[PDB]
């Protein structure tokens, strides 16, 4: 639908849609921007992630409410849970398709490549939340593979306080705890990530320190929930 709109106009409209809390419109604008075929700047990668995370967030919350009602229990609750689930899978497939065509292959700098591989892990993780049986096993391994590739690049190329490296580690730990039935791996990764970041905070400016400590606090909040 966005092929006739200028790239810069799509980006400006994405920012307006964000201000208006119109996240579906924000995601359509950012999909159109990606489909222009150019690489995304830092700010543009943030807009893409904000848009899709808010869309799939509403779907994830609705699916949890419907699955709870269905578990408590005619065909209508299952049919409607299935409708929401299919829409959620379609959003995840759309994001994964943008990453595969062609954001990841063109991302050479660590900050872009790690961010996109983290996103790949995250959207396979959202697919895994609603998957059953053998479908779930393959989707879990796809998430795990993307997170591991991102982790290996982040540990080689980024300091331990880097917010992207922290946010990756924080989501990989969620994957281990919530998806992979590996709570011990989740706790170990959160603890090591936290402690290595703590030891590198002395290198940061006031503003960088605030960026890093905000993600570190999420690691600590999870360790408090998990232990």
């Amino acid at each position: 639908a966005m092929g006739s709109m200028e790239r810069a106009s799509l980006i400006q409209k994405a920012k307006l849609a964000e201000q208006a809390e119109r996240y579906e419109d924000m995601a359509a604008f950012m999909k159109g921007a990606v489909e222009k075929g150019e690489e995304l700047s830092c700010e543009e990668r943030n807009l893409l992630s904000v848009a899709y995370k808010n869309v799939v967030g509403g779907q994830r919350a609705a699916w949890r409410v419907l699955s709870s009602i269905e578990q408590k229990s005619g065909p209508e609750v299952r049919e409607y849970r299935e409708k929401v689930e299919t829409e959620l899978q379609g959003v995840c497939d759309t994001v994964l398709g943008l990453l595969d065509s062609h954001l990841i292959k063109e991302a050479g700098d660590a900050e872009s490549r790690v961010f996109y591989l983290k996103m790949k892990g995250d959207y396979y993780r959202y697919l895994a939340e609603v998957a059953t049986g053998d479908d779930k096993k393959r989707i879990i391994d796809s998430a795990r593979s993307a997170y591991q590739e991102a982790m290996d690049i982040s540990k080689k190329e980024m300091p331990p306080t880097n917010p992207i490296r922290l946010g990756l580690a924080l989501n990989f730990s969620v994957f281990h705890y919530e998806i992979a039935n590996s709570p011990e791996e989740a706790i170990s990764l959160a603890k090591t990530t936290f402690d290595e970041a703590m030891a590198d905070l002395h290198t940061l400016s006031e503003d960088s320190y605030k960026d890093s400590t905000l993600i570190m606090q999420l690691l600590r909040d999870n360790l408090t929930l998990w232990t």
Partner: peptide, 13 residues
């Protein structure tokens, strides 16, 4: 129940 990352990981570049 677990907390995952915000969509934006830091304020700037």
């Amino acid at each position: 129940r677990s907390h995952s990352s915000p969509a934006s990981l830091q304020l700037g570049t």
